[PDB]
Amino acid sequence: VMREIKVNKLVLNICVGESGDRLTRAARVLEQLTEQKPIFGKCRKISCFVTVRGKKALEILEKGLKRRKNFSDTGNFGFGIGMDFYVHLSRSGYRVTRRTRRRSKISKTHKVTKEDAMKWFQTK
Amino acid sequence: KSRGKRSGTRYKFSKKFRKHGECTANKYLEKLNYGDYVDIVCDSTQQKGMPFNYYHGKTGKIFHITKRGVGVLVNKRVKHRIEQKKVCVRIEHVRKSRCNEDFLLRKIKNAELIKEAKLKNEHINIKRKTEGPKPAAMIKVPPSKIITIEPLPFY
Amino acid sequence: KVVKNKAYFKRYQVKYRRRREGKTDYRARKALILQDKNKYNAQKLRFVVRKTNSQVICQIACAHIEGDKILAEAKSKELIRYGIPVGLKNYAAAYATGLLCARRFLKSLNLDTQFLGVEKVTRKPIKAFLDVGITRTTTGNRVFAALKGACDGGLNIPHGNNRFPGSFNPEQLRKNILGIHVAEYMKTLQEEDNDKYKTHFNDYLKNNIGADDIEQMYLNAHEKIRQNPKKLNAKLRKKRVKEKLALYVEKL
Amino acid sequence: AKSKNHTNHNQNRKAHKNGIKKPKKHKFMSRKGLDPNFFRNQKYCLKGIQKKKKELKLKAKQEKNN
RNA sequence: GACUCGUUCAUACUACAGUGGCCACACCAGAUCCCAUCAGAACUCUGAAGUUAAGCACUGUAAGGCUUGGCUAGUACUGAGGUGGGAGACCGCUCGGGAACACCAGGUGAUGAGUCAU
RNA sequence: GCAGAUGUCCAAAGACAAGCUCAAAGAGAACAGAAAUCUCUUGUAGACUAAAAGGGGAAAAGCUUGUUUGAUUUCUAUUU
RNA sequence: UAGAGGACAGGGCCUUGACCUAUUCUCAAACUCCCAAUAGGUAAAAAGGGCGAAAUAACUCAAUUUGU
């Protein structure tokens, strides 16, 4: 089939909570980790985070591999090291909930759920 | 003390339950010609071209047609006399009136009816029949279903 | 709490069917179909361009109360008989489909000889307005390829020049209309790695086309398209729930 | 001192004493502020009609009165 | 058997299931080019290796909702009359009009123009 | 009479277009906690829309962005 | 206003609550899914309507003959 659970998205998060200097350094570390520019948080500017996909995401997750509760009921997970990994994984066909023209919802048969997410984590 | 434009229109100018949202695209295809009748039903979703409170639910004749608006002559009662008022609205707030639809259908139906009757040279009465007293009827009912009725006691 | 409450369902108002399906905008639609009420019997033709991920389609529509009437219609799959056997989703295919719709419409109206359109690719004509169709209108979108095709076919479709590939680049427009970008992708893929090239343009090879023949197969396609345009009722429901209840008595 | 602020008493019967007069509803209405570029073209239409009629009338009158 | 543009705007929605794909819709492969971002996710472009898992279509549920009919009920309320009753609150009679919530039952769509495939 | 509001405010909070969807909840992630940021799910508006209150609004009338000055000159038919 | 059933907080498996689900007693001039009676509006043909031809126009339309 095509029911395989792939890493849809991996998001690195750095919540510094203050102004620049340290925020710019936190941007630099995310830059060297992944060659794409980061994005800053709220300006109520307090955090930097970036999104990666595909082979780079898989390699970064492999580097971060170094628990069976950090899994969400919707079938995602994350951890920390200082910085935060969060991987949202899904089956193929997730496009139908994100595309503009015929946007719709996948059935819970197609949704990943925590059991399948755990099994995928142990298999990878 | 307070007499603004939309004063008193809390309920009249509110969309009905589960009937909110802009008008259907089909409303813009409604054909309007000069001199035909029209109802003024304010559509609160469209704020421009909105008629005054009084004219909601009034029928008038078209006297002017613009690119997106209609001018309609409406009778308004002002103390001791009626007078025509030229109300200018947008097309969303106006709707073709069925006030004379039976008249138009009657005109066509009677046209063909009296055409065929005059062909067969019969003098026919064409006016509406204002039905009144019904004739006698010799009607039989099976006695197995004639129910006797008595007033009921109190409980 | 539950948000999907019975009260929530009671108070819910559904969108229009086509909005729920994500087909029509319903704001662009009425801005497109609304005509001045001074103008009586003014049709306001709409040139609908819709691109599936298999082929593009173009049609001429006139809005009517009972439902739109389609006066002309062309699909990219018709280019098989006009000599284009592959790439029915290209900028070039969209151009050709628009050309087909325009020429066929004019032929149905008996107006080809009075509206020849342009020759090759650099009384008032029929006026139609382009219908977007949800797609984002970036510079280089194929809807404007189809619009250019219909303008070259002879229809008057009002448009700016800002959305052709390049914000104006007539040469780039021409090369995309003849699919020179597809040919150039073929060249680069062949030069760098033949395996990716032959796994990407597999059906192109199976058609024995040339990266140097994409152009010509589009030009002669243009000339030869110009030259010739189940149900269950309460009884069964009751009986079936009776038997399901009787079964659930023993099994569970 | 204090007085009656307002009343509509007797107003309806005053209104009906001389009846509720209706608008006259004349056959023609002024086109002054109505649809320019349509009523101007109607002016041109009518001028053409009048000239075409009047030249026939002049021809017939001249040929019947020598 | 499908698609595009529509109409009606829940009998059309929602949840959970089951079934299905000649072309067809799609998911899907990719990022040189137009274009696009933190991110080819989206959008845009170029494809045709895979797949009905999903979207999509059809069906099911003593399903919710919606809709129709019944019943609530000539009940509530109400127009006109009364030198009617009653201390009053209120309540009849005469000539008329007539609900709602709830509950019960059936149903869960229909359709205009054009086109593809066989 | 009752509950209130007005003598303002705005080069954007005006104009147009595009993209996006809000409040809130739940689950999950180093520091990080009832609250910081990030991810998913549900989400008919329970947000926002300068201000009183009432209407209207979801591929918007809300949010973000881009370009702007139609907050321009003149004149009608008119509504309150 | 009352209880009934149930996976977070607290104390000693228990209890207190919170919260959730289905119920329950009672209400609104500035509440409304629904919704009367009465009151209100428009129409019910001749200076008009229907159906055709022929003219006119600088309007409208792709249309010197589309439409009005």
Q: Strand order across the biggest sheet of chain B?
A: 4-3-2-1-5
Please estimate the helix content of chain B.
10-25%
Greatest interface and its participating residue counts: B-C, 21 and 18 residues
- SS-based class of chain B: alpha+beta
What count of helical segments of chain B does DSSP give? 1
GO molecular function, one term (chain C): structural constituent of ribosome
Domain Large ribosomal subunit protein uL18 C-terminal eukaryotes (chain C): 214-249
InterPro entries (chain C): Rbsml_uL18_euk_arch (IPR005485), Ribosomal_L18 (IPR057268), Ribosomal_uL18_C_euk (IPR025607)
Subcellular location (chain C): Cytoplasm; Nucleus
Layout: helices, strands, pairs:
The structure is cut from a larger assembly and holds chains A (124 residues), B (155 residues), C (252 residues) and D (66 residues).
Chain A: E1 6-15, H1 22-33, E2 39-40, E3 47-52, H2 54-64, E4 76-80, E5 84-90, H3 113-123
Antiparallel strand pairs in A: 1-3, 1-5, 2-3, 4-5
Chain C: H1 6-11, H2 17-21, H3 28-33, E1 45-51, E2 56-62, E3 69-75, H4 79-82, H5 91-108, E4 128-131, H6 142-153, H7 170-177, H8 180-192, H9 194-200, H10 202-206, H11 214-226, H12 234-250
Parallel strand pairs in C: 1-4
Antiparallel strand pairs in C: 1-2, 2-3
Helix pairs in contact in C: 5-6, 5-11, 8-9
Chain D: H1 11-17, H2 39-65
Chain C binds three RNA strands through α1, α2, β1, β2 and β3.
GO biological process, one term (chain C): ribosomal large subunit assembly
Organism (chain C): Plasmodium falciparum (isolate 3D7)
Subcellular location (chain C): Cytoplasm; Nucleus
Overview of the structural elements:
The structure is cut from a larger assembly and holds chains A (124 residues), B (155 residues), C (252 residues) and D (66 residues). Chain A has three helices and five strands, in the order E-H-E-E-H-E-E-H. In chain A, 15% of the residues are buried. Chain A is an alpha+beta fold. Chain A has a five-stranded antiparallel sheet with strand order 2-3-1-5-4. Chain B is extended, with a radius of gyration of 25 Å. The N and C termini of chain D lie far apart (90 Å). Classes of the chains: A alpha+beta (124), B alpha+beta (155), C alpha+beta (252), D mainly alpha (66). Chains B and C meet through loops of B and helix 3 of C. Chain C binds three RNA strands through helix 1, helix 2, strand 1, strand 2 and strand 3. Chain C: It holds the Pfam family Ribosomal_L5e. Chain C: Keywords: Cytoplasm, Nucleus, Ribonucleoprotein, Ribosomal protein, RNA-binding. Chain C: It comes from Plasmodium falciparum (isolate 3D7). Chain C: It is found in: Cytoplasm; Nucleus.
